[PDB]
Design a protein around this ligand. Structure first.
Ligand SMILES: CCCCCCCCCCCCC/C=C\[C@H](O)[C@H](N)CO
Ligand SMILES: CCCCCCCCCCCCC/C=C\[C@H](O)[C@H](N)CO
Ligand SMILES: [Cl-]
Ligand SMILES: [Cl-]
Ligand SMILES: [Cl-]
Ligand SMILES: [Cl-]
Ligand SMILES: [Cl-]
Ligand SMILES: [Cl-]
Ligand SMILES: [Cl-]
Ligand SMILES: [Cl-]
Ligand SMILES: [Cl-]
Ligand SMILES: [Cl-]
Ligand SMILES: [K+]
Ligand SMILES: [K+]
Ligand SMILES: [K+]
Ligand SMILES: [K+]
Ligand code: NA
Lengths: 242, 245, 58, 287, 242, 99, 58, 49, 49, 48
């Protein structure tokens, strides 16, 4: 017979090895395929789709979860008030976990790219207002006041026929890729902080609600990619599935 | 010029002066089944205008505390007009749909409905609360008919999945300050070219108030929501006597 | 070796550079994955195409 | 001729091996153009990109998009079943076991598949067997595939093991793990993880509501196993089955499961303890 | 020696593996083949051949099995009477089990195609009559009366010099292939029901039998195919063969 | 009575649509029906008893002792072929020893 | 390798795309099965060929 | 019989000999016997730098 | 199967053997390299310092 | 829900103050005589 020599690795079963295995049904032919709408080829196709961000993820909401899908704005009495804040880290525990983007990138160890958060105002047509939305890259904790937040990347949103506005969280990192950030050494990969401030005020005339809500949708932009496929922390077989 | 629209099919026409475009699910228009994909050999019946027209179902009332509703397709029409009759007399059915959900208020009301189409909307039960009981939804819940049903736990769509991600499906929003209707065109989606209109619901239509309705007292409080749907390219095969289920 | 065409993925092969030593195609490896995408069907399934320049509602 | 009245997809595929580049942009000050403003009501996601909201530099991005191709996401062997044949107890002191093929018993793989509504693929099955404590002994086993309608063995020596037509594999617990390729076998064009319907006609009385969601097109039969011998084997046996999807296609993405799984055949969830998709905090203004 | 590495599958014996094994008799030459009529190449060649259907599979027949090979028709006193009924499911227990088609498709898990049942009238030459034979696709149980059955696919047969008529059971399924139907979840794959009714009446003059029989032959049409080879339930080694 | 099977097809008895059928006929080729290893014999050499405490056994080759394979072959009157024989051996309880 | 022609199936090879490493052809694999058929010899073995148009007995 | 598994940063670490994490549906795992030769694999350059 | 015959050396692990081992992450792509001053290729480059 | 099965228009209030319902000629005869209770109800046009 032909001279061979077994090398290390012999007999091992590597779950990700892409090899050839003998076929159990010789000459078998599958049912032909038919056309079905909605075929996907790459997870990135999905990551570009906006899904709802749970900015209002309060402990007091847990029993009325629906209230987590949108946060409020209302007639202010003082100027420059902070409306809401949250981290931009998409693979981190928090608001992003509710998005399909967040869930999917948790199946990968690293990511790279610019993100996009679109805010839709759901108040009455008679309500007007201007908000300042800011992205503060790494380094400074939550800006203390609007005048400090204003120094970062931001958008000044005006309510009108266009119900929504888009804040861009441009990829501003030192490394080409970021691993998922979390407290500790890995905070090195944090993306930053998003803050929403009252630029002027929520104004409404007599006859309309003095409080309204905003829905936040988030997704990835075209330069987004992920790498190093891994298992997600977000699912557990706590007990046997019967 | 994108806010105005007219839909005319069969002997029916819909108008709207506050639209927000139209969605074509997964980018595909409905179409009759082609000979390459087909398998059943009998020549089908394609009634055309008697079934591809707009049908308006029962109206629901939106309250400051509504949880949300859903309807299953083609269940909603299995007993309406000529479409239902064809669905009953034939084993095989296939079609697409034009879904038009209506809801108007005033420039002083507020709220936002998420209107979505979820293919193969399989429902689950709360498992006796504790989760030790393997209970199942009764016919009336899985196939609510033209009246539709109410979600008990919208946050998980009564199926253990996050409402927060439903936008990954064909959808539109009816945000009172912006528009008063949603329109979605849905193509046939299934693992088989034709199927039973009675045993299998291809998709579900969900209408959920994500941003609750609100208004100052004194303003009109009856804010209905109406669903009008039209089968498109309805085809039927496997003729025999009528069967209701 | 020239085989039986019975792979699950042949209508529009999501693969295309596989290895195999058996008469049945489905025994083949997964091969190198292609990089085709069509995000528009999910991100912009609207009739009149809204541009990123003017307001999406005119 | 004497009766006049008797007489598509706007989007397609591109190859994107790398992430989009960033073109340099400068300041834009003017009326009419307003890319930052959107209308999410349309159902479309925002079309705005970095260059429209800020001043950008040029970036030649070479990041690959290959690892997120569904093929690389799924073609990784995962556990789909654990079968046991103990020697003492109420389990199976019979020396054989018949397992109804159902892969929805383990969450890791299940959640990944349920990201889609329909999937079509071939599969590589690997059979890892050992004693319950991980030790190995010179035991001869036989694994047999019993398609729907084929006689299921009723004993360690039922005639069915003659396996004249069904495919069987004979391997030792000491040999490496057995491995084979399986084609796409549904009578449908694709396996479907969600079937909003009933398998048969009739009234659907609460007595048979367990029929709901059961799609016969996914029922692939039985997988049988036995120690090869007329006499009982003295060894308890633990068989772990791994599946690796290959040559895959998928349709219609859906929200990912966010409540623990309770049953193999349905999406029932524990209603008294509905988990929030995201962790919580005290104030919306504090981290 | 050449570097190799054993992969999973090593040492296994797969009964359906199509490999190469060493030859025991080197240089051996078989007896030459000679021409023999009747060579077959594909089981489908046989499935197209009509064989007898046991429509009259009564419990009271079992001891006089020959009586199962044909069913009767006789002078009716009432109009529209039902003559016989049975399922079209070919791989199911019942009448089809007696046909070579039925037996063979039991060696496969799935099938697809149109079937064909040909009825031969064996009454006297002086007997006349018209029967309505119907195929009711899935959904409706056995039609209650002829007027209901009449709504499905059917053939109205007239007795004459042509002793027989052919009912076609066209492939009308949702799926491209059907697995063998049986009570339970698999009833999803049922093919349907065949019913035979009196369109007019079996009429005979003085001097001829008032009862006669019909033989039913069944087979597959040209679009018939089977897939996923498997073992049949129809044979068992109940005891040792000596 | 002629001895021929019916020549009628769907299009003659009903109105049909066009169907481009791609279902394969390959799996029913006799080669794929038969080329699947099946049990044709079980031989035993026990150490105690009236069986074969001799350490050897002579078996007359006759493959008709097991029904599954036999019924398949008897579907035909004459068959000509080559064959692959596999010999699976072990102790009666399935254990293996250096013999 | 060029072999001895001793396969059981060579008068009219029911196979034709086999694999082999020995000098004897019968050691070869089964190969891909061909799809030839001739149902007429079983379904219509009649002398005057009866058409599916006129009555089979004239 | 042993199982070696790679748990990238952020992946759930097994907490017991039978933690669900060993289902290894996405992480790469190697199953080998102490009697087989030594297992061996290739690893790419993985830093985000 | 193809006739083979194991030769001495079979199963051994030689620390300096330059062979091929199966990859654990299929389709994985490393972070691109960037220019960094001071690359060395041969120890001799240093010995001259 | 019954009326909905006939020829109809769904009107939405907005800047366009009006909408037009078309009563298409759907008759058996080429012409209709004036309808009134009795035999002549044969020529009725219908109901809005
Ligand atoms: C000799 C080794 C035989 C190995 C045979 C294994 C066949 C398994 C085929 C995979 C089928 C995919 C799973 C299909 C459906 C899901 O389990 C459904 N949820 C069950 O209801
Ligand atoms: C060293 C291994 C030797 C293996 C030799 C096995 C030779 C067996 C040849 C197969 C012959 C086909 C069976 C022929 C006839 C049937 O058994 C008859 N029914 C016996 O009367
Ligand atoms: Cl040699
Ligand atoms: Cl992150
Ligand atoms: Cl809820
Ligand atoms: Cl790849
Ligand atoms: Cl045995
Ligand atoms: Cl050498
Ligand atoms: Cl059947
Ligand atoms: Cl073949
Ligand atoms: Cl485990
Ligand atoms: Cl081989
Ligand atoms: K292998
Ligand atoms: K690029
Ligand atoms: K061999
Ligand atoms: K190696
Ligand atoms: Na814009």
């Amino acid at each position: 017979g032909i001279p061979t020599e077994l090398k290390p690795g012999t007999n091992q079963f590597l779950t990700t090895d892409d090899g050839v295995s003998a076929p159990i049904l010789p000459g078998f032919h599958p049912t032909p395929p038919i056309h079905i709408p909605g075929e996907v080829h790459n997870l990135l196709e999905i990551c570009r789709v906006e899904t709802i961000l749970e900015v209002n993820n309060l402990k007091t909401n847990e029993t009325t979860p629906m209230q987590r899908l949108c946060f409020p704005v209302s007639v202010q009495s003082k100027t420059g008030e902070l409306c809401a804040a949250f981290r931009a880290d998409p693979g981190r525990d928090g608001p992003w976990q509710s998005t399909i983007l967040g869930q999917l990138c948790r199946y990968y160890t690293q990511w790279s790219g610019s993100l996009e958060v679109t805010f839709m105002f759901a108040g009455s047509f008679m309500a007007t207002g201007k908000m300042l939305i800011a992205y503060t890259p790494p380094g400074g904790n939550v800006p203390a006041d609007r005048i400090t937040a204003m120094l970062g990347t931001h958008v000044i949103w005006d309510f009108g026929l266009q119900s929504s506005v888009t804040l861009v969280v441009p990829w501003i990192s030192n490394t080409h890729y970021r691993a998922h950030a979390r407290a500790g050494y890995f905070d090195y990969y944090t993306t930053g902080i998003i803050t929403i401030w009252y630029q002027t005020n929520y104004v409404v005339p007599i006859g309309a609600p003095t409080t309204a809500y905003i829905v936040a949708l988030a997704a990835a932009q075209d330069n987004f990619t992920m790498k190093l496929c891994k298992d997600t922390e977000d699912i557990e077989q706590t007990a046997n599935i019967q | 010029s994108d806010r105005v629209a007219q839909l005319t099919i069969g002997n029916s026409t819909i108008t709207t002066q506050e639209a927000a475009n139209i969605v074509i699910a997964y980018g595909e228009w409905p179409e009759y089944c082609p000979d390459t994909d087909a398998t059943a050999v009998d020549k089908p019946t394609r009634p055309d205008v008697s079934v591809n027209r707009f049908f308006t179902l029962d109206t629901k009332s939106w309250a400051k505390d509504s949880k949300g509703w859903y309807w299953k397709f083609p269940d909603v029409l299995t007993e309406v007009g000529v479409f239902g009759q064809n669905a009953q007399f034939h084993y095989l059915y296939r079609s697409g749909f034009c879904v038009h959900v209506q809801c108007n208020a005033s420039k002083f009301h507020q709220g936002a409905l998420l209107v979505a189409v979820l293919p193969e909307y399989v429902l689950g039960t709360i498992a006796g609360g504790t989760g030790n009981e393997n209970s199942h939804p009764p016919y009336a819940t899985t196939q609510p008919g033209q009246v539709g049903a109410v979600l008990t736990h919208p946050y998980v769509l009564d199926a253990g999945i996050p409402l927060s991600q439903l936008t990954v499906c064909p959808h539109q929003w009816i945000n009172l300050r912006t528009n008063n209707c949603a329109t979605i065109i849905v193509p046939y989606m299934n693992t088989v070219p034709f199927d039973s209109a009675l045993n299998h619901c291809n998709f579900g239509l969900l209408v959920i108030p994500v941003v609750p309705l609100d208004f100052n007292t004194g303003a009109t409080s009856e804010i209905p929501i109406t669903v009008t749907i039209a089968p498109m390219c309805a085809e039927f095969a496997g003729l025999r006597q009528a069967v209701k289920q | 070796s020239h085989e039986n065409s019975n792979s699950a993925s042949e209508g529009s092969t999501i693969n295309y550079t596989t290895i195999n030593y058996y008469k049945d195609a489905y025994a083949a490896s997964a091969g190198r994955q292609d990089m085709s995408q069509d995000p528009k069907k999910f991100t912009d399934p609207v009739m009149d195409v809204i541009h990123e320049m003017a307001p999406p509602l005119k | 001729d004497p009766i006049a009245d008797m007489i598509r997809s706007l989007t397609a595929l591109q190859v994107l091996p790398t992430a989009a580049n960033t073109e340099a942009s400068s300041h834009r000050l003017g009326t009419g153009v307003v890319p930052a403003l959107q209308a999410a009501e349309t159902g479309a996601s925002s079309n705005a990109s970095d260059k429209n909201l800020i001043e950008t530099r040029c970036v030649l991005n070479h990041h690959s998009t290959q690892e997120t191709a569904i093929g690389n996401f799924f073609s990784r062997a995962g556990l789909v079943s654990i079968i046991t044949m103990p020697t003492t107890g109420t389990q199976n002191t019979d020396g054989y076991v018949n397992w109804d093929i159902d892969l929805m018993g383990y969450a890791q793989l299940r959640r990944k598949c349920e990201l889609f509504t329909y999937m079509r693929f071939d599969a590589e099955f690997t059979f890892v067997v050992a004693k319950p404590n991980g030790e190995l002994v010179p035991q001869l086993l036989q694994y047999m595939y019993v398609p729907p309608g084929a006689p299921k063995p009723t004993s360690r020596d039922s005639f069915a093991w003659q396996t004249a037509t069904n495919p069987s594999v004979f391997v030792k617990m000491t040999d490496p793990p057995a491995q084979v390729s399986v084609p796409f076998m549904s009578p449908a064009s694709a396996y479907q993880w969600f079937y909003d319907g009933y398998p048969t006609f009739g009234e659907h009385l609460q007595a048979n509501d367990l029929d709901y969601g059961q799609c016969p097109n996914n029922m692939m039969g039985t997988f049988s196993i036995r120690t090869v011998g007329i006499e009982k084997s003295p060894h308890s046996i633990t068989l772990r089955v791994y599946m690796r999807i290959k040559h895959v296609r998928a349709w219609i993405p859906r929200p990912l499961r966010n409540q623990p799984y309770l049953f193999k055949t349905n999406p029932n969830y524990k209603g008294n303890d509905i988990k929030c998709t995201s962790t919580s905090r005290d104030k919306i203004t504090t981290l």
